[PDB]
Amino acid sequence: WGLVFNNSVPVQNPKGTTSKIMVSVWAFFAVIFLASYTANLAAFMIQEEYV
């Protein structure tokens, strides 16, 4: 959950260079999802439905 949101104090649970691929791809997916959510919110903020 640390990589999905604003960075916090991390834990060095992985031990080795062969386990960083999973956390790296998870972080990439999380940041892509966060960027998409922010862009969707920005697009919806200018909607004319609100009255």
Partner 1 sequence: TGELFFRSGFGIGMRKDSPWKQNVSLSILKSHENGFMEDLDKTWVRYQECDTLTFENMAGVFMLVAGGIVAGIFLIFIEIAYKRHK
Partner 2 sequence: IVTIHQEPFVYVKPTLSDGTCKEEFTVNGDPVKKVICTGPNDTSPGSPRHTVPQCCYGFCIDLLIKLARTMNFTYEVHLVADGKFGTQERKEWNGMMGELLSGQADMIVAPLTINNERAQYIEFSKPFKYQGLTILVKKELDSFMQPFQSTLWLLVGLSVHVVAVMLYLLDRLSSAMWFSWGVLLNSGIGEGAPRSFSARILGMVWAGFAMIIVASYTANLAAFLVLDRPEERITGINDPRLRNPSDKFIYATVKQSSVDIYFRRQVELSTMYRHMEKHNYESAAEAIQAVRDNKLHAFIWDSAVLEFEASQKCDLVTTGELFFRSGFGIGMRKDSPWKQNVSLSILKSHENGFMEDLDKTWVRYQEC
Ligand X SMILES: CN[C@]1(c2ccccc2Cl)CCCCC1=O
When the beta carbons of 22 and 27 are compared against its own copies, the nearer one is 27
Answer whether 3's CB lies under 8 Å from 24's CB: no
> What does 3 interact with, of partner 2, its own copies, partner 1, none (CB < 5 to 8 A by kind)?
partner 2
Indicate the helix (H) or strand (E) that contains 51.
none
7 is an interface residue for its own copies by CB under 8 A:
yes
What residues line the site for partner 2 (CB under 8 A)?
A: 1-3, 5-12, 17, 20, 23-24, 27-28, 30-32, 34-46
